[PDB]
Amino acid sequence: EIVQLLMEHEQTDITSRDSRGNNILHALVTVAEDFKTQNDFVKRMYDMILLRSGNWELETTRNNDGLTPLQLAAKMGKAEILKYILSREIKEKRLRSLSRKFTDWAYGPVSSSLYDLTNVDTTTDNSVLEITVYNTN
Amino acid sequence: ERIWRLQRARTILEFEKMLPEWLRSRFRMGELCKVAEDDFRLCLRINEVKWTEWKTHVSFLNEDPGPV
Amino acid sequence: RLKKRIFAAVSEGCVEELVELLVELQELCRRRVPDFLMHKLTASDTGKTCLMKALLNINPNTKEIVRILLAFAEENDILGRFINAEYTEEAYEGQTALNIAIERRQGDIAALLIAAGADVNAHAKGAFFNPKYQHEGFYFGETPLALAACTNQPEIVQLLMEHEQTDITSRDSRGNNILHALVTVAEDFKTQNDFVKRMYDMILLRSGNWELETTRNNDGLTPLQLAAKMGKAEILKYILSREIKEKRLRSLSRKFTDWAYGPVSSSLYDLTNVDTTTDNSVLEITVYNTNIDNRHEMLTLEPLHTLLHMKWKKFAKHMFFLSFCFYFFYNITLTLVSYYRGWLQLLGRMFVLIWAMCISVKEGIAIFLLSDAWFHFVFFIQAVLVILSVFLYLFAYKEYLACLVLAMALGWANMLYYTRGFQSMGMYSVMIQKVILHDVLKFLFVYIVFLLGFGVALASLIEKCPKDNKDCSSYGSFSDAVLELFKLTIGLGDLNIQQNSKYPILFLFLLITYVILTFVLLLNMLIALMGETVENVSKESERIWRLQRARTILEFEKMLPEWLRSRFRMGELCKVAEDDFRLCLRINEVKWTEWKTHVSFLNEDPGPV
Numbered sequence: 001e002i003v004q005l006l007m008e009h010e011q012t013d014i015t016s017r018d019s020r021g022n023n024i025l026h027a028l029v030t031v032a033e034d035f036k037t038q039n040d041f042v043k044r045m046y047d048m049i050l051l052r053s054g055n056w057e058l059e060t061t062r063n064n065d066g067l068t069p070l071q072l073a074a075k076m077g078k079a080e081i082l083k084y085i086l087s088r089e090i091k092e093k094r095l096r097s098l099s100r101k102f103t104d105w106a107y108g109p110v111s112s113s114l115y116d117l118t119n120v121d122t123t124t125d126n127s128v129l130e131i132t133v134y135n136t137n
Numbered sequence: 138e139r140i141w142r143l144q145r146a147r148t149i150l151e152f153e154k155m156l157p158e159w160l161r162s163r164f165r166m167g168e169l170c171k172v173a174e175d176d177f178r179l180c181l182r183i184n185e186v187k188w189t190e191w192k193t194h195v196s197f198l199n200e201d202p203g204p205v
Numbered sequence: 206r207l208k209k210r211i212f213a214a215v216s217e218g219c220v221e222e223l224v225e226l227l228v229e230l231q232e233l234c235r236r237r238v239p240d241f242l243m244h245k246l247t248a249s250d251t252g253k254t255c256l257m258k259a260l261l262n263i264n265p266n267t268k269e270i271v272r273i274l275l276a277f278a279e280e281n282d283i284l285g286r287f288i289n290a291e292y293t294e295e296a297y298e299g300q301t302a303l304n305i306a307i308e309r310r311q312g313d314i315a316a317l318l319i320a321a322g323a324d325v326n327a328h329a330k331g332a333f334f335n336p337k338y339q340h341e342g343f344y345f346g347e348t349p350l351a352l353a354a355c356t357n358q359p360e361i362v363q364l365l366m367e368h369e370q371t372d373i374t375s376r377d378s379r380g381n382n383i384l385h386a387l388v389t390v391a392e393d394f395k396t397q398n399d400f401v402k403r404m405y406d407m408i409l410l411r412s413g414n415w416e417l418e419t420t421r422n423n424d425g426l427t428p429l430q431l432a433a434k435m436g437k438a439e440i441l442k443y444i445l446s447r448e449i450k451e452k453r454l455r456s457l458s459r460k461f462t463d464w465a466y467g468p469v470s471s472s473l474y475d476l477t478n479v480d481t482t483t484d485n486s487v488l489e490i491t492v493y494n495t496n497i498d499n500r501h502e503m504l505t506l507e508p509l510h511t512l513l514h515m516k517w518k519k520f521a522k523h524m525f526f527l528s529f530c531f532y533f534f535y536n537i538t539l540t541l542v543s544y545y546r547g548w549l550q551l552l553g554r555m556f557v558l559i560w561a562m563c564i565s566v567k568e569g570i571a572i573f574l575l576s577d578a579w580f581h582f583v584f585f586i587q588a589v590l591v592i593l594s595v596f597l598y599l600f601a602y603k604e605y606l607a608c609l610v611l612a613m614a615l616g617w618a619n620m621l622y623y624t625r626g627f628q629s630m631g632m633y634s635v636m637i638q639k640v641i642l643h644d645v646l647k648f649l650f651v652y653i654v655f656l657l658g659f660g661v662a663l664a665s666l667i668e669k670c671p672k673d674n675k676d677c678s679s680y681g682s683f684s685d686a687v688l689e690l691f692k693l694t695i696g697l698g699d700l701n702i703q704q705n706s707k708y709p710i711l712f713l714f715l716l717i718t719y720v721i722l723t724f725v726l727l728l729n730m731l732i733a734l735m736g737e738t739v740e741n742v743s744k745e746s747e748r749i750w751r752l753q754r755a756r757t758i759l760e761f762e763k764m765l766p767e768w769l770r771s772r773f774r775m776g777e778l779c780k781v782a783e784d785d786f787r788l789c790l791r792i793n794e795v796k797w798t799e800w801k802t803h804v805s806f807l808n809e810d811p812g813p814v
Contacts, residue, residue, distance in 0.1 A: 105184075
C-alpha cells in the first residue's frame with residue numbers, strides 16, 4: 001500500500017541510485033536470500049513495480065560495480081527471483097513489451113515458449129551464463 | 138550429477154571462448170524474432186507440453202501456428 | 206487492400222462495425238462468382254480464411270463476430286463451401302474451424318457451427334496431424350471427437366455423439382480409431398490426473414457394441430494390443446477390470462461377479478485375446494515387448510498374474526526342473542570325459558552330441574528371431590565349442606582339450622541361469638547380472654589402463670641389462686611385469702628392492718602409487734555399488750526376476766504343440782447373458798472394508814457347482 005502511495009506521488013524518484021550505486025531492484029536482489037525464509041513476497045513486489053513503471057530503464061542500469069540487477073542476481077545466489085525474471089509472460093498488450101517469455105505457437109497442450117537471450121548469449125563483455133558458471137561462493 | 142554438469146558447463150564455455158568471433162558468429166544458437174512495436178531481439182525457441190491446466194491462449198504473436 | 210484490412214480487423218477483433226461496413230463494401234464489390242468473393246476473402250497461400258483467423262485470434266467480442274460472419278456467408282449462400290474449407294499446407298492439412306475452436310476450447314461456437322452445417326467427420330491428414338518423433342507435433346487421432354476426448358471436454362462429446370451425422374467408427378490415415386488415440390495419449394496418471402479413463406467409459410456407455418475394440422489398426426492391433434505395445438497401465442487396469450451393474454450394457458463388462466455370500470466373492474475375468482491363442486496375445490505381446498519399463502506394473506494385475514501362477518502350478522515347473530536335470534547330467538558327463546581324457550562312454554558321447562545339437566539349434570532359431578538375452582549366445586558358444594572339440598578329438602590335434610574345457614566351465618557358469626528358478630536365488634542372480642553389467646566394467650577398464658601404464662613404466666626401468674641371467678631381471682617381459690602387478694593386487698606378489706635397475710626409489714614409488722590407486726578405485730566401485738543397491742537391489746530384483754520368469758514360462762509354453770496345449774489350457778468356459786459364451790478364469794478375493802450388496806450376479810446358487 002505504501003509503495004502504491006509513493007509511486008502515486010509525483011515528487012518520487014524511481015531511478016534514484018544509492019551511494020553504493022545500486023537501484024531499487026538491486027536491493028531486492030540482494031534481499032531474497034532464500035524462498036523458505038521470506039515466503040516469496042519479493043517477486044510480487046518486483047512484478048508490481050515493473051507493472052507500475054513501463055520502461056526498460058531500471059533493468060538497463062549498472063551499479064558502481066558495473067552490473068545489471070540481473071547480473072547482480074547472478075553475482076548473488078538469487079534463484080526464484082531469477083526464474084521470475086527470465087520466465088516473464090504478460091497477457092497485457094500495453095506492457096507486453098516487457099515480458100521476456102513469449103508464447104507464439106500453441107495448438108493445445110503443446111506450445112512454443114520463446115525466451116530472450118539479450119545479455120545471456122555471452123556477447124557483450126559478460127553474460128549470466130558466464131558470470132554464474134565462473135562464479136564462486 | 139550436479140557438480141558434473143557444472144564442470145561440463147564450465148569446460149563447454151572454455152572451448153567456446155577459445156574460438157574467434159566469426160566462427161562463433163556462425164555457431165550462434167540465437168535465432169532472431171520480431172516482437173510488437175517494431176521490437177527486434179534475439180531468442181531461443183523451445184517447445185514444451187502441459188496436460189494439467191487448460192488455459193486458452195489469447196496472446197500469441199504468430200497467427201499461423203506452425204514451424205513451416 | 207481490403208483482405209489485409211479484414212485479417213487485421215479480425216486479429217485485433219476490436220470492432221464488428223468495421224467489419225459491418227467492410228462486409229457492405231465486399232457485397233458491393235461482389236457485383237462480378239461466389240468463388241470470386243471466396244478468393245477475395247481467402248488467403249491463397251495456406252487456404253486459410255478469416256473465420257480460421259478469427260477462431261485463432263481470440264477475444265471477448267468473438268461470438269458476435271462469428272454470428273456476423275456466418276449470417277453474411279448465409280446471405281451469400283456460400284455457407285457450405287466456406288466452413289468446410291481446410292488448409293492446403295502440408296502440416297496444416299485438413300484442420301477446419303471446428304478443430305481450431307476446440308484447440309481454443311470454445312464449445313458454444315462449435316454448437317453454432319454444427320447448427321450451421323459443420324463437418325464433424327472431417328479428417329486432419331498432415332505432418333503436424335500425423336507426425337513422428339513425438340516432438341514438434343501433436344497426434345490426437347485426426348478427428349475432432351478425439352480432440353475433445355484428449356482435451357477433457359465431455360459436453361462437446363455428448364453433443365457430437367448426439368448428432369446423427371457423426372461417424373464414431375471412423376479410422377484415421379494411420380489406421381487408428383478413437384480408442385487407439387486415447388491409448389497413445391495415456392502417458393501417466395499423475396500428469397493427466399486420470400480423466401481419460403472417464404472418457405473411455407463414457408464413450409463405451411454411449412456405444413453399446415464390441416465393434417471398436419474388435420478393430421485393428423494398419424499395424425493390425427486392437428487398442429488393447431496397442432496399450433500392450435505402449436506403456437499404458439492405468440487405462441489397462443480399467444480395460445481388463447470392467448464391471449457394469451447396468452443390465453442393458455452388462456454384456457460389455459469383462460469383470461464379472463457371479464458368486465458372493467459376504468466379503469468373499471468370485472471376480473470372474475475374460476481371456477478372449479489374452480489366452481495366447483490367436484496369433485498374438487496381451488501376455489505374449491507385453492512380455493516380449495521392449496522399450497517399456499512399466500512391464501512390472503502391467504503384470505501385477507489380477508488376471509495375468511493368476512494366469513502365470515496357474516500355468517506354473519499346472520506344468521511349467523515340471524518342465525523347468527526337467528531341463529535342469531538333463532543339463533545337469535549333460536555337464537556332469539562332460540566333466541567325467543574331461544577328467545578321464547567302454548560301451549557306456551560311446552553312448553554318453555552320442556547323447557552329448559545329440560543334446561548339443563538340440564540346444565545349438567534352439568539358440569540359433571532364437572538368435573534368428575532376435576542385456577536379458579545374454580544367456581542364449583553363451584549356450585550357443587558352448588555348444589559350438591563342444592562340436593569343435595568333437596571334431597578336433599577325431600583329428601590328430603592338440604587343441605581339442607582347450608575348446609572342450611572352455612565350454613565345460615562356461616556351462617558350469619550357465620548353471621546360474623537355472624539358479625534363477627528359486628525366489629531368493631532369483632534375486633541373487635539378478636544381482637549378479639546387474640553388478641557385472643553396471644558396476645564392475647568401469648573398474649576393470651580403468652584398472653586395465655592403469656595396469657598398462659605402470660607396467661610399461663616398470664618394464665622400462667627394469668630394462669637394465671639382466672647380466673646374462675633371467676632370474677636377475679624381474680619384470681623383464683612386459684607380460685611378466687603385468688603378471689607381477691596383478692599377483693600383487695591379489696596379495697601374492699614379490700615386493701623387493703629391485704636389482705638391475707637405474708632408479709630403485711622411483712620403481713618403489715610408482716609401485717606403491719599403483720597399489721594405492723587400485724585400492725581407492727576398488728573403494729569407489731564399492732561406493733557406487735552401495736549407492737545403486739540401497740534402492741535398486743530390492744525393487745529391481747523382484748520385478749526383473751518375475752519378468753524373466755514370465756519370459757521363460759512363455760518360451761516353454763511356445764515349445765509345445767496345440768493338442769497338449771489344448772489339454773493344459775487354464776481357461777474354463779463360462780456362460781454369460783444374451784447367449785454370450787466366453788472363456789474365463791475364476792478368481793476368489795476378499796474385501797473387509799466396503800460393504801456393498803451384490804445386486805448383479807450371474808450364478809443364483811452361490812457355490813462352486
